[PDB]
Every structure is written in structure tokens, then in C-alpha cells.
Amino acid sequence: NLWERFCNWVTSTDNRLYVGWFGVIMIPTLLAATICFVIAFIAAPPVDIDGIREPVSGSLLYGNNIITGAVVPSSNAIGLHFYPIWEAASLDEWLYNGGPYQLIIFHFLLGASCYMGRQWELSYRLGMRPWICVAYSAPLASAFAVFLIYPIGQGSFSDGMPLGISGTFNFMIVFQAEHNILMHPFHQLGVAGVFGGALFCAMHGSLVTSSLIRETTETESANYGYKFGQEEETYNIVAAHGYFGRLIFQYASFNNSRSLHFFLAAWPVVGVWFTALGISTMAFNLNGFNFNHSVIDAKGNVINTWADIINRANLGMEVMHERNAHNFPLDLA
Template sequence: MGSSTVDEWLYNGGPYELIVLHFLLGVACYMGREWELSFRLGMRPWIAVAYSAPVAAATAVFLIYPIGQGSFSDGVAGVFGGSLFSAMHGSLVTSSLIRETTENESANEGYRFGQEEETYNIVAAHGYFGRLIFQYASFNNSRSLHFFLAAWPVVGIWFTALGISTMAFNLNGFNFNQSVVDSQGRVINTWADIINRANLGMEVMHERNAHNFPLDLAAVEVPSIEG
């Protein structure tokens, strides 16, 4: 919003807008740069697609979250599950490396960067895991496995951003009462109104049914706090 003085700019949250909006613009442009680089190198754009998840989450948290109150729970399963399976896969890979060197040399010396040959035995690793848990919990195809490990956290973070963005605009939490008016009764919009709406949104979230307007907010008179 426009401000005529520095004090008004500071009061209206100018520094936050300046930093956050430039940050979001920067990370969005970086995502475009990742896509452009992969395109020029003839690669598939999965790096940019994966990076879109934290970009969406950052946009939801830093831009949408100050307006309302959202929920992070939608992405917990995706992030935790992806981390768990990635750690599990890493331990299986470490345990089934194909040694190309002697015992006196590091196993890392036997590999070339970008080599086509596999560096570990996926059949042995996930065959063991399939017997440890159950057969269909393991992967025999390396491409399918790594796609799953990448897609699960990314989709989880996408849903996190979606949950924050949708619940932030909970219209049942708005009361449209302005906090500052001038002598003529005209509204002076401030960030206090945004915070007020966020507080109402949080109170709605705590109700049993998020579609019901809280009774204490719907009351014409302010309820007494005396016993």
C-alpha cells in the first residue's frame, strides 16, 4: 500500500512487504532459471518441479499466513514419510554397495561420477527389505523407487501450502469491523485489521465445526468475563 511518510510506511508493515515480496519474487525466478537450465541441457524438468514445493510453501507461509491462519498438518505425513523412506533407502544402499576396490581402498574410489553401471545391488537391498516387512513394500525398479522418494515429500509440501492458503481465507472468521477510522468515519486500513482477521480465523479453527461462527464473536454485546 502507498505511504506518504516513512513513519506511515513502517506502521503499515512496509519492511515486511519489502523483504518478503522481493524474496518470493527471487525464489520464483530461481525456479524458472532451474527449468530453463534443464531445458537447455536437454534434461527433464523434475528439479524445477520439486523446487516448486518449497516455493509454494514459502509463498503460503510468508504471504498468505499473515492474512489468516492455516494448518500445517496436511504436509506432515508427506514430509515425514518421505524422510523416513529416504533414510531407509540410504541405509539399504550403504549395506549393498558393489565393491570395485580392495579392502585397503575406499569403496568410493571404485566409482566414476555419472557412470551408467549401478553402484549398489537394488535386488539384494530391497529383496531384504521385502522379506523384512512384506513383499510389496519393496521396489525392484530403481526409477520407480527414486520417483516415489522424490514425489511423496513434494506432494506433501504442495498440500501443506494448499491447506494454509485455503484455511487462511476462512470467510466465517471475518467480522469486517475496522479498527481505525478518521473523524469523518472513513476507514483507515492497517495491518491491525489483518491481524484481527487472523485471530478470528484461529478461533474458528478451534471450534468443533469450522463452518459455525463462534458464538462469542457472533454476540451483539461483549460477553462478561466476570464469574
């Protein structure tokens, strides 16, 4: 009998949120991550990323400012293994081998995953379509790609992606010096998806703003809104479709509102869809292009193509990434 009274609670509106079966995991999970994570950033002790005995400490108390960094990746020794708290000894240990990293990550992904489920489930209790579930799927998938797949493809969570601002940058740099991304279509479409969204989110909102109902209670001293009850909605779509059409050409402009908003959710999502793949594909070593040589068979004199000066920089960095943690000549992972 009780069991029935509980479910009804979870299922409908609670005057704050909606916490369905999906948030039954999402809420306790994302909490453990938050708390742990906030504290790790304010006091975590140094952590030696690559097994080496050279601890890096990117926490507030240990001499950092916000940009300087945060929660550092597990050791390269525990690298790919499961490192819970119970599994170790003293926390002085745990804290050194990157525990916080794993703990925070895994809870976050799981609850991150469920935050997505929750999005759909709310749709089922409100009779609306299931799309928002899909558009979130892009970044989520990406987080996983960066936080999981790679360390899974590489052989150790260490060098997953630090939880600091600064290290984000590091991960990036090291990354293209090791796999050369810039020249990979999936990260190229990525810049397309993003620079896309920028150009469109500006375009739409720009036009939507220019073709407004010029005459609705808007004077030069006041500006007050609309509300669903408002039939004609805010703008004269004929003015916008007319505007844009006259700036380039008829086809160029969009006739109806579906093709407009569908585009807005299509471009970005399918751009990151790919990028998130990009990484996941270079997680197992299928690195970007690399046109290192173009010649003059005349003598075979090598001619440097713009791309070689790209390899000249990619080079300097390879050489010094993870200084003194290499004992053999060629990195293989």
C-alpha cells in the same frame, strides 16, 4: 547487432552459474532483499505490528540474540495497503511502520518465483526433462501461502510471518489457537509428507548404502568413490530388493529404480502441496475440525473428549494473543 551478443551470454554456461532471462530478474531482486534483510536484522528500529502504539524491536542492536527475532511485519494500519518508500515521508517513519517487511517480502517472492523458472530454463538448454521445476513448486507455493495468501486472506501483512526465528514460533502458536490446524487433514498430510520424507530418505540412503559393490577398491584403510564412467554403479540392487523384500514382503520391496526414486519425490512434494494449501484454505477461514462436545443424553452431562483438553490449551492462548489490541468481544479475523 549488439543485442544479439548479449543474449548469447545470458543463455549458456558462464563458469559460475547460468543466468537466463529468469535470473535477469532473480539476480537483482534477491539481492535487494538479501541486503535490506541482513541490515534490517542488524539495526532496524522497533516496529509496531498491530497499529497500536507499542513498538516491538527484534533486531541485533536493539537487544536481541539470534533466536530472539528479526524483521518485523508491517503495521496493521498500513496492514493491507501498498507501503513503498517513496510513498512515505522520512525513513524514520518508514522504519517504524514495517517498511523493510514489504520491501523484502515482495522482492523475495518474485525472485523466489524466478529461481523456480530458472530451474526449468536450464533444463531447456540441457535437453533434460522438466520436473525439478515442479518439486520446488511445493515449498515456494508454501512460502507464498504463509507470506502472501494469508495476509491477503486476513486483511493485513502484519501477522504474515515474522522474519525471525522466534516469531516463526509465535506465528505457529497464535495460528493454531486461532484456526486450530492440528486437526486439519492438510496439515496432517503435511506431517505425513515430512515424517514421510524422513522415513524414506533414511530408508533409501540406508539400503543404497548396505547393498554396495562390496568388492570395489574398498579396503579397511581407504574408501574412494565412483564416477559416471562407472558402469555397474555403486550397489547390487538385487541385494537391496532382496533385503527389503525379506523384511516384510515381496510386494513391499521395489523392483526397479524408477518406482524408487519417483516415490522419493512423490511423497514429500504431494504432502506439502496439501499443507501449503492447508494454510491457504485457513487463510479464508475454513479452519480445522473441532469436536468440542460428546454427551450423555442421560442428563446431557458433557463428557470431555481428549480433543477438549486440546481446546483448553487453544483457549488460554486465544485469550492472550495480541493482548490489549482488542476492544470488542469477539475477534473476527
